[PDB]
Amino acid sequence: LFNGLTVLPPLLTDEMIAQYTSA
Amino acid sequence: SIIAYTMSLGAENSVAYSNNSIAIPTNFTISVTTEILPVS
Ligand SMILES: *[C@@H]1O[C@H](CO)[C@@H](O)[C@H](O)[C@H]1NC(C)=O
């Protein structure tokens, strides 16, 4: 892979996603 | 009052698997859906 630039997280995780796939 | 939950992806189910198993239906169905799209 401050000065008012904000980075955000996503709605789904690197984990849940890995759980969707399994299905 | 208000709450915050972890997001459940769906209801746990399972497929009864076995090396000599099958699932075949008996009754069909018809089900209308929708799909809205832009054109202009
Ligand atoms: C099929 O489904 C319809 C309604 O869902 C029902 O009226 C009918 O009896 C069903 N037929 C069989 C063979 O289960």
UniProtKB/Swiss-Prot annotation, chain B:
Role of this protein: Precursor of the fusion protein processed in the biosynthesis of the S protein and the formation of virus particle. Mediates fusion of the virion and cellular membranes by functioning as a class I viral fusion protein. Contains two viral fusion peptides that are unmasked after cleavage. The S2/S2' cleavage occurs during virus entry at the cell membrane by host TMPRSS2 or during endocytosis by host CSTL.
Span of the entire protein shown here: 691 to 730 of 1273
Protein name: Spike protein S2
Residues carrying a glycan: 19, 27
Organism from which the protein derives: Severe acute respiratory syndrome coronavirus 2 (2019-nCoV)
